[PDB]
Write a protein that binds this DNA or RNA. Structure first.
Lengths: 95, 95, 95, 98, 93, 89
DNA sequence: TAAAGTGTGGAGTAAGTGTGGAGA
DNA sequence: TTCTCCACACTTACTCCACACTTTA
DNA sequence: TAAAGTGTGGAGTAAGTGTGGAGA
DNA sequence: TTCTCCACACTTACTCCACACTTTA
């Protein structure tokens, strides 16, 4: 499963940058693997929470998981991914 | 589009299908199955199911909604779904 | 001309010709695009009414008045309410 | 995707495009997105300021503030060569193209 | 430190930068193209010149230029890498 | 690529391989790359801290967690030298 | 055996229907 | 006026809880 | 000419980011 | 512990309103 220099091997559970392997947490893996299906879609915090976490936690906690993932992407020279869409949620890539 | 192992949920029509047939689900029952199919293997607590799929009523009332859904699944030949995880809550499917 | 199961655009006619109000015409013409979709009251209000600031219950009354007109031409079980969500033009089959 | 006369709104991405023969993406604010997405349902309908406020702002603010949101949206439409949209209907409110 | 109209190429680091100051993820071929053409921005380079200078049938040349162009457009830089029909390409009019 | 007795480190990809498998190392854990230069040398906790970790038990814990990842596959590799530090051997 | 979960069944009440009527 | 909207009571059926049976450590 | 609408600009404030740290 | 979540301050940019100009009957 591939999108613009980000490869996810689902079996078993590795995410590569074009190949550098990332050290992702389980939550972080779920986020990137969920959003890469529809890269340009805006996912709400509620959707990311239900699909990638665990509560039942705060919506701000979603933001922090996305931040931590983003930092890991930037340290492999991938910037302008995980863009926030103010008041709605997040998007993997904008057209 | 939501699909998982012979259970299809069309979110636009509010329909849930079994492959082999449309189920007559209540709104609460629809929310439960649509919530849990996001993370099939995850154990959801009664508190999570209550806040997402139902008042701050009793936790036992969650059990009854899950039971009624389970029965409807079993009458379409689906038995190994909605497993209770003792003292925590419920899981859609074991890994 | 939009056709769906015994219910038949430039003329503003719905067919045997029905005497529909403008609101009523908009409702039936809006919902026939996606017959089996559940439309919320908010969607019907924004698309088919004046006073988007009106009550959601007023949507129900427009649908009722349309339904009555459909039933007097021998069309029953059509504008089905989906409790807590909204309305649907027709239920899907269990096939 | 909501379409009306050279204005496309993709609701999943939250994107609004202008179409000759390429799609230009607009940089709308959330309020601005709600306005255009609300009014495109009934293009020819006159929406009052009260309707736009309740549906697109989320405030108890002044009605003149609605005008400013519509203005800012209009300017963004005009810079993509779209002039005949967002017509004011004096004393009532606003309408998408006549 | 080659500069031209909002495009900076640092030749020592092999970095190209584009509202400060976004680094582009260019391939080696792509780097050579942009670094070659920025010397004479307005010059029309032939496909033969770009091939000999930047690429170590014709659709492949065009494809390298396309992929570079897309990377420029995602940083809000459009109407760069203009094709001159039957000859080749130009960085800017 | 840095090689030593069935442990390969590719420095360009930041990957560490076991011969027989890619390891899922943290950045701190990757910084195995320091000790493989002088496999038999005893590195102090102070040296490992300054070079790899951008009280004393915390250094030990990083080394332990690396060791466990080696053992899940390679045993007897990150030998502790009591009170002083660690050796790859 | 306690501890916890399942499942049928019914009372209350949430939610929707539709007649009627006031305002433009 | 008609049509749109709202009001008021009618009407429907789902949600919740009860009580007993069954399963699990 | 009144009346109403447009549009630039600025003050306050939502909303998002990311470091840091407590709990399992 | 690590990871998950939450808190706090930093930072960004959108909303709202003001004030004057412009447009319409």
């Amino acid at each position: 499963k591939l999108y613009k220099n980000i490869e996810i091997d689902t079996d078993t559970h590795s995410v590569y940058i074009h190949k550098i392997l990332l050290n992702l947490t389980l939550t972080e893996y779920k986020i990137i693997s969920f959003m890469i299906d529809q890269p340009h879609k805006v996912f709400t915090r509620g959707e990311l929470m239900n699909h990638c976490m665990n509560s039942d936690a705060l919506e701000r906690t979603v933001d922090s998981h996305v931040s931590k993932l983003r930092k890991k992407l930037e340290e492999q020279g991938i910037f302008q991914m995980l863009i926030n869409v103010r008041g709605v949620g997040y998007r993997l890539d904008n057209p």
